[PDB]
Design a protein around this nucleic acid. Structure first.
Ligand code: MG
Ligand code: MG
Ligand code: MG
Ligand code: MG
Ligand code: MG
Ligand code: MG
Ligand code: MG
Ligand code: MG
Ligand code: MG
Ligand code: MG
Length: 1105
RNA sequence: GGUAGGAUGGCAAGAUCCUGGUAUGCUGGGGAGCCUGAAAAGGCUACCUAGCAAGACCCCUUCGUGGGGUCGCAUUCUUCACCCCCUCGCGCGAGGGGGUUC
DNA sequence: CCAGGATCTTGCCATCCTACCTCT
């Protein structure tokens, strides 16, 4: 079975692709391309418009389900409490729309004397407050909510705006009181802002907070004189909220101790470890050399950094006052970036941060927790560390001292430095003890405390272990399929080459502005961090830093309309929204008021500003452009300029264009994680080395091996000047992987130097031995790639999605239409009947000797009969009676008393009937709702051959010829076609071109076509396999940059894409030599029929068993 | 030494999920106001209320077409088949995962 | 949208380790 040869593996990752090569070798030269293939994956994306992954959509749906389930349980507990109290909950129907609001208003205004009426109004109000309670921090308890200032400043500003807007003053002016007053005074007023799409205004502008509803509840209990235990139980039932939790398996494991969880940043062991490691990395000047700090100097600096309350010790202070050095610059190896006026020495040394937080909390709360203050001063650092570990790991889903419950609530309300560190608590304590006692650094402490050697590297994940990142998992699944198939074919690889997504070929001024930008970012982030710790934000997130930056930048106003905003009612609006692919980069983030954010919604900003009467486009662009530079802000001059241009360019767009910036993080993560798992495979399988090379070393290798993708695959120019990029053809990933199999480190250094020389703005051949042996080894690589591409041995393949999982139907429920039994029945109304047995009865009426509905969508099928009684299996309909019908004449299923359209088609079943010399073809397009209502979403079901009933939307909206042929007993299923199946038209190409395809084939003779969809009953959507789609996107964008940068072939490609080939099923499946190609992991077509999807010719496919 | 990789700590910029909430929206049931109406019933603006993938599994029950709980859109060659790994871990065939070469 | 937890990438600063090439 295995034919072992010496071969190398090249791995070239991409965001939507991965190129994998198995290249058999000689002593240093390539011998044969064993397999080269570009695998085109979706990056996990199931939301093509938004870019959100399938895992992200599943997680948001699951969390919405969990929210609804917890809300239902909480409301049931409230209903039990109201039944205990004798308070009547708000009824489901037959009450006024304003009964709850007037209940809240009256209970806030005057004492209700009537006993049953007061209980009814209290039940109405409390049930309505539980349904609409406002937002609170989920990490804060109900006691913290009671500790909040009531009402919030947002509601006080909203109430001031309402008293100004309506010239009245309600007392005490609660949310229910103002809402009832406005719903009675100005009927039809909306309360909260919503998305715009003749117009009106809204009553409230900010997000309702839970302290506002809590304060209204306290005001109602104060007016009505309710007992305190009663209102405390009511507050517990209304504002009950499940605390957020961290699953323990979501926390990584310690590499030195693989059973233990990674320690939190809050741990005092980590704070000591960071201090001792930072001190152990410092050096001291000694006669043009450097020495490590001696053990007494280590102890002095370490005790000065441990015994610290705040950031008071700079590295200059460590050099001068602690080390007693004559000069500041004698302290070398300071772990900061250097700058003017000794910036690195002016940066601050680390300290015990958790001990500072706990000591400051004690100093502010001596009377609140004096027992804890005495106990904290009493305990040693081991029990202190165990306390701190318990306080840090309370957030884990899955306190050693009998403390009072108020002290427990104050301690769990304490804010500690979050984040995980690399090691566990035991490992950190052991390493710290070894570094303190032996006077060694971290590497020697690891060698001592664990017995590891100098070659020790942390354990790496195996190939079967996923990461949880969708793009990385796509690349890894493709890689492990390729590696298993290649290992069983040719044995294990001799070495493995992975391309990392790292680059360094930049000019010195680019490095200078990046260093100055980093300096400015750190300085402004430190100042804003100090302001937020002064303001109570103990641990500012990057979102908090962005929010404080834009509050400072726009003088606490909204960016869009200019309304004054606070910290708590402002919102960080994605200017390009998340549902249009917008990123969390700070140029995409605008500070808003919440009302502007809700009214903009998911729309582009320029279109929203055109439609809206609240903001103006020119005013927002002008307000951005008049921002002026100052002394010390976050951006540099050039960064402030580019920030203004990128913000303005985001504010100016009118369509839902794709996002400008794409995720290079998942490219680097895919390369790094695939390298780690390939290293695990190499440890298991005896691979000699796993080598890594930069992104710009492979391209420089390809351009110095006289290989260009245009010349290799006979591509044409698509630009008027110069030559286009190599990304037109999808096979360039496999060519990149083939080139990667050749590279060695010395050649990598020389091509990196050549690239740095070239981008340092002809052409000098690089001067080195390693380049010369690489060229003499790889002179035949060009001939080998030409011979491989001429036979089309390089494959572009898309992995199939065959599992019947995903959205069963479209999200929006739709109201049922209706049609009288004894009236005229057309074809579209007969195809829309909701009830399957009523449907089958109408088919029995039109055609008793038939099982399907073979009627035209426009023809009048049944006449208007006043004596037509549809006899059901259990009922008789009347001619006056009406039938539920689906609203529109497309595939639909009934969902929860409404109608939902079916989702995208899971597959098409290919049917072939007629003569063998001239067959007829059709597709039974089957969706996930078809299998859902056919009961096929269970165990032991082949979804591509399991029979569907005639009332499913597959058989309802099949073609008339297909329906008549299955009725006649001539059409049997011969295969299936998922979106992503490759069609091979043979070496002769395709003949049925006309109009746009004929012009496409004069520049692009494409024989390989990928199914993307099934638009209607006689059309299959095909795109060329070999040509990219993002390439077509950037060509169509770059057409309008200059007056006709493109050539004629570029215009042909841009006017073929993105609709590509809207084919015709009975035309394209009758091509001679057409084969539906199902490939193996090595890009080779699977032809032997086993238990995996095989290749099949539609013209000569035998019928299904 | 220089280049490249890896560790740890720091700084900066981002990505990916996960947990809990808010508000909207959709559909069913309602209705406060307004309009067109009325021997002749529907819309509009809000608001209230239930549900918000189809469904699966467990427990009820002082027996019901329902109450309660846990889940259900990922891992993209479904199912079947053969091999492998971790867990039902006695060379057990039941849960998850992985591979099947043209 | 909100708070906040977890995983990870890239780039710089410091330290340690590894392999590898290039000169003298
Ligand atoms: Mg590449
Ligand atoms: Mg809720
Ligand atoms: Mg609520
Ligand atoms: Mg509203
Ligand atoms: Mg927004
Ligand atoms: Mg690539
Ligand atoms: Mg409403
Ligand atoms: Mg609602
Ligand atoms: Mg449900
Ligand atoms: Mg498989």
């Amino acid at each position: 079975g295995t034919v072992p040869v010496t071969w190398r593996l090249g791995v070239d990752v991409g965001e939507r692709s991965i190129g994998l090569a198995a290249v058999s070798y000689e002593e240093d030269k390539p011998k044969e391309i064993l397999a080269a293939v570009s695998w085109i994956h979706d990056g996990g994306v199931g939301d093509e418009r938004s870019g959100a992954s399938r895992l992200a959509l599943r997680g948001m749906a699951r969390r919405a389900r969990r929210l609804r389930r917890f809300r239902r349980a909480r409301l049931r507990d409230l209903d039990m409490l109201l039944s205990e109290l004798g308070w009547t909950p708000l009824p489901d129907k037959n009450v006024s729309p304003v009964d709850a609001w007037l209940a809240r208003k009256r209970l806030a205004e005057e004492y209700v004397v009537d006993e049953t009426e007061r209980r009814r109004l209290l039940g109405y109000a409390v049930s309505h407050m539980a349904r609409h309670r406002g937002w609170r921090n989920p990490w804060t308890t109900i006691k913290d909510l009671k500790n909040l200032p009531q009402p919030s400043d947002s509601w006080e500003r909203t109430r001031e705006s309402l008293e100004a807007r309506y010239s009245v003053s309600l007392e005490p002016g609660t949310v229910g009181q103002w809402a009832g007053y406005l719903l009675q005074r100005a009927p039809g007023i909306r309360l909260n802002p919503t998305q715009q799409s003749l117009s009106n205004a809204t009553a409230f502008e900010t997000r309702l907070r839970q302290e506002d509803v809590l304060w209204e509840l306290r005001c109602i209990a104060d007016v009505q004189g309710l007992p305190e235990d009663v209102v405390s139980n009511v507050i517990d039932a209304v504002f009950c909220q499940k605390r957020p939790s961290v699953p323990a398996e979501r926390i990584g494991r310690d590499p030195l101790d693989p059973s233990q969880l990674r320690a939190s940043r809050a741990c005092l062991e980590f704070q000591e470890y960071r201090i001792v490691a930072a001190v152990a990395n410092l050096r001291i000047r000694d006669g043009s050399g450097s020495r490590p700090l001696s053990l007494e100097e280590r102890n002095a600096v370490i005790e000065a950094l441990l015994a610290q309350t705040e950031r008071s010790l700079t590295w200059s202070d460590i050099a001068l006052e602690i080390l007693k050095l004559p000069n500041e610059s004698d302290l070398t190896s300071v772990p900061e970036e250097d700058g003017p006026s000794s910036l690195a020495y002016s940066q601050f040394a680390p300290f015990d941060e958790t001990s500072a937080r706990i000591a400051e909390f004690i100093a502010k709360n001596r009377r609140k927790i004096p027992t804890f203050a005495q106990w904290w001063q009493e305990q040693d650092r081991t029990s202190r560390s165990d306390l701190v570990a318990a306080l840090a790991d309370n957030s884990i889903a899955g306190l050693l001292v009998h403390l009072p419950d108020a002290e427990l609530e104050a301690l769990e309300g304490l804010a500690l430095p979050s984040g995980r560190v690399a090691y566990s608590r035991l490992t950190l304590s052991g390493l710290t003890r070894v570094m303190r006692d032996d006077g060694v650094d971290v590497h020697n402490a690891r060698k001592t405390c664990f017995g590891v050697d100098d070659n020790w590297r942390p354990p790496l994940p195996a190939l079967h272990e996923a990461t949880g990142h969708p793009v990385v998992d796509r690349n890894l699944a493709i890689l492990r399929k390729f590696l298993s198939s290649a290992t069983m074919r040719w044995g294990p690889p001799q070495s493995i080459v992975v391309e990392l997504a790292r680059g360094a070929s930049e000019s010195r001024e680019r490095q200078a502005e990046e260093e100055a930008a980093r300096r400015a970012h750190r300085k402004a982030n430190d100042r804003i961090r100090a302001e937020l710790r002064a303001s109570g934000l103990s641990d500012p997130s990057p979102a908090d830093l962005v929010r404080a930056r834009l509050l400072e930048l726009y003088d606490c106003h909204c960016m869009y309309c200019g309304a004054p905003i606070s910290w708590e009612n402002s919102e960080l609006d994605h200017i390009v929204p998340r549902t249009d692919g917008g990123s969390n980069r700070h140029e995409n983030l605008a500070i808003t008021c919440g009302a502007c954010n809700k009214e903009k919604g998911r729309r582009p900003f320029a279109s929203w500003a055109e439609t809206s009467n609240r903001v103006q486009l020119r005013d927002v662009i002008d307000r951005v452009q008049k921002l002026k530079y100052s002394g010390n802000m976050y951006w540099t001059r050039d960064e402030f300029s580019r920030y203004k241009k990128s913000v303005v360019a985001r504010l100016k767009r009118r369509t839902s264009d794709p996002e400008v910036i794409q995720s290079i993080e998942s490219t680097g993560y895919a390369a790094v994680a695939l390298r780690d798992r390939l290293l695990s495979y190499g440890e298991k399988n005896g691979v000699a080395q796993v080598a890594v090379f930069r992104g710009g070393v492979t391209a420089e290798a390809r351009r110095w091996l006289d290989i260009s993708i245009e010349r290799l695959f006979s591509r044409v120019a698509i630009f008027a000047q110069s030559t286009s990029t190599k990304r037109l053809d999808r096979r360039h990933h496999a060519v990149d992987a083939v080139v990667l199999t050749t590279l060695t480190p010395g050649v990598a250094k020389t091509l990196a130097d050549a690239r740095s020389r070239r981008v340092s703005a002809s052409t000098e051949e690089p001067q080195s031995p390693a380049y010369r042996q690489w060229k003499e080894s790889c002179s035949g690589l060009g001939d080998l790639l030409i011979s491989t591409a001429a036979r089309d041995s390089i494959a572009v393949a898309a992995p199939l999605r065959l599992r019947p999982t995903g959205a069963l139907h479209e999200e929006t429920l739709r109201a049922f239409s209706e049609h009288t039994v004894g009236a005229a029945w057309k074809g579209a109304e007969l195809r829309r009947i909701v009830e399957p047995e009523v449907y089958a009865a109408f088919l029995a009426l039109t055609d008793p000797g038939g099982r399907f509905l073979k009627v035209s969508p426009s023809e009048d099928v049944l006449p208007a009969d006043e004596n037509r009684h549809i006899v059901l299996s259990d009922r008789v309909l009347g001619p006056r009676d009406r039938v539920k019908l689906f609203p529109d004449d497309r595939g639909s299923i009934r969902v929860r008393g409404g109608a939902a359209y079916i989702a995208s088609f899971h597959h098409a079943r290919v049917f072939r009937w007629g003569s063998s010399h001239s067959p007829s073809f059709a597709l039974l397009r089957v969706s996930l709702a078809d299998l859902a209502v056919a009961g096929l979403l269970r165990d032991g079901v082949d979804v591509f051959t399991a029979e569907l009933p005639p009332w499913t939307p597959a058989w309802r909206y099949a073609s008339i010829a297909l329906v008549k042929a299955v009725e006649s007993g001539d059409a049997k299923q011969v295969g299936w076609l998922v979106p992503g199946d490759e069609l091979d038209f043979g070496p002769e190409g395709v003949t049925t071109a006309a109009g746009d395809l004929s012009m496409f084939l004069k520049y692009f003779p494409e024989r390989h076509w990928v199914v993307t969809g099934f638009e209607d009953d006689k059309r299959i959507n095909l795109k060329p396999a070999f040509l990219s789609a993002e390439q077509a996107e950037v060509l169509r964008t770059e057409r309008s940059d200059r007056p006709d940068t493109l050539t004629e072939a570029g215009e042909i490609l841009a006017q073929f894409f993105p609709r590509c080939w809207r084919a015709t099923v009975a035309k394209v499946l009758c091509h001679p030599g057409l084969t539906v190609i199902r490939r193996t992991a090595l890009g080779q077509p699977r032809w032997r029929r086993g238990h995996l999807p095989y290749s099949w010719r539609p013209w000569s496919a035998d019928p299904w068993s």
